[PDB]
Amino acid sequence: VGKKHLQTLRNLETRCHDSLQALVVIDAGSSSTRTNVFLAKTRSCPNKGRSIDPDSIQLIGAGKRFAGLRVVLEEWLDTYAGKDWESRPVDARLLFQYVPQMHEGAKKLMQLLEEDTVAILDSQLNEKQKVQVKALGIPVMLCSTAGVRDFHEWYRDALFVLLRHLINNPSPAHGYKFFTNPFWTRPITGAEEGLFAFITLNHLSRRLGEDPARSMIDEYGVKQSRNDLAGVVEVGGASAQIVFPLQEGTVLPSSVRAVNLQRERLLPERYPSADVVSVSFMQLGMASSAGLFLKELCSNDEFLQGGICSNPCLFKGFQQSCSAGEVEVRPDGSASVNEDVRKNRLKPLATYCSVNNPEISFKVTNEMQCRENSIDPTKPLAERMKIENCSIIKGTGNFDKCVSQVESILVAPKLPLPANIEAASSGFESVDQVFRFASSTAPMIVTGGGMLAAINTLKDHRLLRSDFSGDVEELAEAAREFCSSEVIIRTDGPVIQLPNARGEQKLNSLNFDLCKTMALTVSLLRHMAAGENQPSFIKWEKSIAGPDGKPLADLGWQVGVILHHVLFTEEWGRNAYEAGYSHNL
Amino acid sequence: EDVRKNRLKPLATYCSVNNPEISFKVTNEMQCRENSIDPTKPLAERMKIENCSIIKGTGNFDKCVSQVESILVAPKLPLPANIEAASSGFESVDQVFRFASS
Ligand SMILES: Nc1ncnc2c1ncn2[C@@H]1O[C@H](COP(=O)(O)OP(=O)(O)NP(=O)(O)O)[C@@H](O)[C@H]1O
Numbered sequence: 001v002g003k004k005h006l007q008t009l010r011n012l013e014t015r016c017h018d019s020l021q022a023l024v025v026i027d028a029g030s031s032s033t034r035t036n037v038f039l040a041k042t043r044s045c046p047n048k049g050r051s052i053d054p055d056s057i058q059l060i061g062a063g064k065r066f067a068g069l070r071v072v073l074e075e076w077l078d079t080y081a082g083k084d085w086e087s088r089p090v091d092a093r094l095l096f097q098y099v100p101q102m103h104e105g106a107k108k109l110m111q112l113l114e115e116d117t118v119a120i121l122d123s124q125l126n127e128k129q130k131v132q133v134k135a136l137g138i139p140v141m142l143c144s145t146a147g148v149r150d151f152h153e154w155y156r157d158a159l160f161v162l163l164r165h166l167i168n169n170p171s172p173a174h175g176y177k178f179f180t181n182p183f184w185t186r187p188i189t190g191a192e193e194g195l196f197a198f199i200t201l202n203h204l205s206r207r208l209g210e211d212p213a214r215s216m217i218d219e220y221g222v223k224q225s226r227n228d229l230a231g232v233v234e235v236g237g238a239s240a241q242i243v244f245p246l247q248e249g250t251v252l253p254s255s256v257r258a259v260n261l262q263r264e265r266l267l268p269e270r271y272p273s274a275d276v277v278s279v280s281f282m283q284l285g286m287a288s289s290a291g292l293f294l295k296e297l298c299s300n301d302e303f304l305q306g307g308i309c310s311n312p313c314l315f316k317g318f319q320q321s322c323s324a325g326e327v328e329v330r331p332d333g334s335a336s337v338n339e340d341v342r343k344n345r346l347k348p349l350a351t352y353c354s355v356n357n358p359e360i361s362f363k364v365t366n367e368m369q370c371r372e373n374s375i376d377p378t379k380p381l382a383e384r385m386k387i388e389n390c391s392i393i394k395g396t397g398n399f400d401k402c403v404s405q406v407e408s409i410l411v412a413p414k415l416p417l418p419a420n421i422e423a424a425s426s427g428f429e430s431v432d433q434v435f436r437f438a439s440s441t442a443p444m445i446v447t448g449g450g451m452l453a454a455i456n457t458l459k460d461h462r463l464l465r466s467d468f469s470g471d472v473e474e475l476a477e478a479a480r481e482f483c484s485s486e487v488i489i490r491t492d493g494p495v496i497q498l499p500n501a502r503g504e505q506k507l508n509s510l511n512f513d514l515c516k517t518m519a520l521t522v523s524l525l526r527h528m529a530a531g532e533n534q535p536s537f538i539k540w541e542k543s544i545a546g547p548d549g550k551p552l553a554d555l556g557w558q559v560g561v562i563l564h565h566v567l568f569t570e571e572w573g574r575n576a577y578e579a580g581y582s583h584n585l
Numbered sequence: 586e587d588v589r590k591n592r593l594k595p596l597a598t599y600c601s602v603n604n605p606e607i608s609f610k611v612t613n614e615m616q617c618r619e620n621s622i623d624p625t626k627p628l629a630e631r632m633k634i635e636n637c638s639i640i641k642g643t644g645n646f647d648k649c650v651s652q653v654e655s656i657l658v659a660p661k662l663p664l665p666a667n668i669e670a671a672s673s674g675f676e677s678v679d680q681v682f683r684f685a686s687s
Pocket residue numbers: 028029030031032145146147235236237238239240285286287449450453510511
């Protein structure tokens with residue numbers, strides 16, 4: 001008993017101890033700002049410090065969707081630059097005297113986020129878990145994506161300074177010790193947004209790891225992955241990312257700039273390497289593409305004829321007011337369009353395309369990109385977003401025309417879609433070019449609510465196989481039949497009624513233009529199929545089943561950004577534990 | 586007249602309609618044309634100064650300056666093959682000191 005009592009205590013002081021840690025990634029995306037609360041198992045060992053078991057990372061709460069950072073900033077500018085700064089020269093050096101107020105406005109948003117996080121923590125964690133989490137500190141990574149990637153002047157980066165200071169002064173009452181630093185909390189580039197999502201996917205599907213289960217050191221000392229790493233396509237609110245690893249030794253054109261995971265510090269040296277193509281396209285997100293598509297379609301003569309715009313991507317029988325404003329499908333089957341500029345889906349693009357944004361004012365090529373998409377930078381905002389000579393939009397439900405319009409407008413435009421200097425510098429102007437220049441046998445996973453709803457809808461109505469493998473022509477068929485549907489108002493509201501007595505489903509604010517996304521998918525799969533190499537397969541997924549069976553977390557870039565930091569164990573240990581929250585004193 | 590020793594050879598060669606960089610990228614075609622290179626013409630033509638027999642010097646510095654200014658230093662479109670500079674946030678020499686300065 002005594003002889004054990006001693007060895008018990010001896011084991012204790014000689015081995016590693018496990019402890020739970022909270023990690024918060026706040027997604028400052030285009031559509032909203034929201035928390036994602038993760039738990040992770042940390043291990044501290046004698047003389048070895050502390051690190052995270054990456055396979056233990058799991059989401060435990062996705063937060064409420066609060067105001068995106070654009071709102072905060074434009075609301076700031078309204079007050080302090082004066083109403084309608086979108087249409088006038090505004091001297092930017094003057095807005096430095098309103099820094100404190102930017103802070104104030106940001107404080108309002110952050111208090112909601114903090115409280116929401118805390119709510120998730122309190123509800124999900126038992127008392128014992130709480131002790132460990134409150135003790136270790138809680139790293140917070142707040143990263144802005146496409147919603148503010150295009151934002152002009154110095155405002156965005158000033159905002160991030162203030163955001164970090166706010167994250168680093170959490171309310172002491174709840175006892176969770178949030179903190180951040182300029183590496184964790186920052187704008188992330190399009191390619192990073194891609195790469196992290198790529199990392200997330202392959203982590204969760206256990207394709208990417210360092211151990212013998214997921215790696216082989218080859219005869220020649222190079223660590224390989226045992227299964228092929230998989231590429232990802234993510235269509236968000238404002239942008240879409242395309243990412244895929246290159247089959248090894250692909251000779252690329254000198255202009256195509258691929259990223260090497262080790263070389264570029266995305267993953268530590270002990271992980272397998274790869275050169276991966278990662279490009280993100282502004283205007284290709286659901287909301288962005290929605291507004292741009294309308295502006296371009298309905299200022300083309302083929303579709304606008306004496307006030308009426310015939311839209312091949314909207315159902316026969318559907319019709320709506322002619323603007324890019326947010327569409328509410330009402331119970332009585334009408335479509336209400338919100339004229340409030342903020343809720344107008346052209347607002348981002350129209351704002352970027354101001355003649356008073358130095359990005360246009362001094363760069364003619366950017367002016368040209370605006371004009372090519374029917375935004376005239378010299379006009380005031382209201383005009384810029386107005387669809388000229390157009391009263392109503394009527395749906396003609398013609399999928400193939402929809403496809404070819406998505407093709408020339410969005411996927412293969414004459415000029416690159418505006419605010420895409422990043423994509424272009426990688427060597428890619430358009431989605432078109434990505435698969436013309438680089439291509440890979442790497443299987444591809446398609447992600448994003450929109451994209452998924454597109455396939456699910458066709459599946460639900462038995463127009464696609466349950467076991468749909470990515471065959472383009474099969475998809476074009478299903479979409480062709482589906483998008484032919486007639487819209488019928490009934491007592492139970494507006495109804496999408498399928499051809500050949502094939503059934504029905506309610507029309508609502510989310511599915512009314514879903515055919516566009518079907519066209520986007522078809523277009524994208526066609527370009528893929530045309531590439532020199534073609535992906536071994538294609539799938540659509542929302543989350544990946546964990547070892548348990550249930551998913552540990554969502555697809556996206558959230559897990560990736562955590563992994564990007566925590567995987568560099570010495571650097572992380574230094575920042576997360578040595579400096580930690582105690583730095584804020 | 587040996588093409589290789591012609592100081593337009595690099596730029597003329599980049600501006601080929603058969604170089605994918607131009608062929609697929611209209612913005613690059615525009616940049617070429619703005620500097621009087623037509624990508625669709627064969628090389629000899631591309632490098633040829635049209636309708637010109639001799640160049641006579643007029644030795645006028647200020648005009649030289651303002652011509653350097655609009656041609657090289659502050660061109661309408663960025664001088665071709667400068668996607669790198671442009672992605673840093675700089676299209677022309679002009680803009681460098683307008684945007685950052687030290
Ligand atoms: N089932 C669905 N059907 C149709 N549209 C959807 C569906 N789910 C979401 N959406 C739309 O797609 C977008 C959701 O993408 P989301 O990733 O939430 O945007 P975000 O991350 O804020 N923008 P980004 O900066 O590109 O990351 C929203 O703008 C929704 O309007």
